[PDB]
Amino acid sequence: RGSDQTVRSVAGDQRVTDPVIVGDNSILDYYGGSNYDFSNNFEIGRGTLYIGKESYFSSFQSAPTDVPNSFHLLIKNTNNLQNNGQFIIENIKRHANQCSNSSIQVFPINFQNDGEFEIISGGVEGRCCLPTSVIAPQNFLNNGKFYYKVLTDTGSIYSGSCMQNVDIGASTTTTVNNNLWEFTGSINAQINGAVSGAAQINLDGSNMFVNANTFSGQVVNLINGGSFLQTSDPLSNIVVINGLGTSDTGVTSIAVKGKGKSFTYNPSSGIVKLTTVEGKTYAYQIGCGYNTKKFITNNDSGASYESADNFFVLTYSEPYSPQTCQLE
Ligand SMILES: [Cl-]
Ligand code: NA
C-alpha cells in the first residue's frame, strides 16, 4: 500500500461507555443495530465515524440484510464531541418500503464540528416518515459543514409530503455557526435555540423555522422551493434571504407568523418589510432587482408548511434575478 489505514466495522446494538477515538485515515463503521447509546467523549480525526442501519461499506447493488427497520441513536452525558473529519448518521434500511422506527438525539455538552457532519434520514413516497431528530448540544460550534438530507430508500432526494421535524438547539443552548448548514429534501428545520456567528444556510427544498430570539450572522439561500419562516417576534438584525422567486425549480417563500396587514419593498435598498395585523414588522434583505408589482402575498393556515401556525407569506412571481443596489 504505502499509507496507514484502519477500518473497524462493528455490527449490532451498542452501549458505548468508553471514548470513541477515530484516527486520521481511519473509518469506524457502526452498523445494523437498532439501539446505539454513547455516553463518553468523541475524538474524530481526519477519518470517518459512521453510525447507520446499513454498513458504510454496502452499496447501491447490495442485497438486503436481515436487520430490523428500527434505529435509535442517543448521545448523552458525553462531555466533548470533536469532529475533524466526517461524522455520518444514517437511518435508512435499503429497499425497505416502510418508515424506520427512528430517533436521533444528540445532546453532548460540547460539539465542535470542524469537518463534515451529515445526517441522512429516509423518506418513503406514499408513506409518512416522521422520525424524531434533535440536535441540541449545550454548546454547538460549527466551523465546518452540517448537512441534513432526506432520501428515498435507494438514495435519491425525497421531496414528498411529511416534512421531517429536525429540532436544532434548545432554549438553554448556544449555537455558533461559522461556515455552512445545508438542509436538503422534505425537512422542517426547527431552530429552537440561539444561533450566532457568520455563515450560510442553504435550504434545498426544505423549510426552516426561526423560533428563537437570536438568529444572527446567518445568510439564508432558498433553493428548489425552500422556504424561510419566522415564528418569533421580529429580530433587530435584517436577515439576508437570497433566492426569493418563482421558476420551474419551484416557488420559494418567506413567511412570518400571523396574518398580513401590508408590505413594502425598496428596490434601491433590497429591504422588504412585512407588517402583520398585530402590528409586528419583519425586515429582510432580499436584494435589489425585484419589481414591486410582481410580489404576491397570501395568508396561510400553516398546513402548506406542515405547521399549525398561521403565516403571512411573501412570494415573487418571476425568477430570482438579483441586481446590485443603486440609489439613483
Ligand atoms: Cl414530527
Ligand atoms: Na394555523
Residue numbers in the entry: 17 to 344
Per the authors:
Though it lacks typical virulence factors such as hyphal development, C. glabrata contains a remarkably large and diverse set of putative wall adhesins that is crucial for its success as pathogen. C. glabrata wall adhesins are large, modular glycosylphosphatidylinositol (GPI)-modified proteins. The A-regions of Awp1 and Awp3b consist of 34 and 33 β-strands, respectively, which form a two-domain architecture with a parallel right-handed β-helix at its N-terminus (Awp1: S18-V240 with strands β0-β26, Awp3b: D20-I254 with β1-β26) that is followed by a β-sandwich domain with α-crystallin fold (Awp1: V241-Q314, Awp3b: V255-E334; both with strands β27- β33).
Awp3b A-region crystals soaked with Gd(OAc)3 diffracted to a resolution of 2 Å, therefrom derived SAD phases were used to solve a native dataset of 1.55 Å resolution. Only few regions with uninterpretable electron density are contained in the Awp3b-A•Gd3+-complex, namely the loops consisting of residues S75–D82 and S320–E322. Interestingly, the T1-loops of β-helix turns 4–6 from Awp3b-A are cross-linked by two disulfide bridges, C115-C145 and C144-C178. Crystals used for collection of the native dataset of Awp3b A-region were grown in a sitting drop vapor diffusion setup. A 0.6 μL drop (0.3 μL protein solution + 0.3 μL reservoir) was equilibrated against 50 μL 0.1 M sodium phosphate, 0.1 M potassium phosphate, 0.1 M MES pH 6.5, 2.0 M sodium chloride.
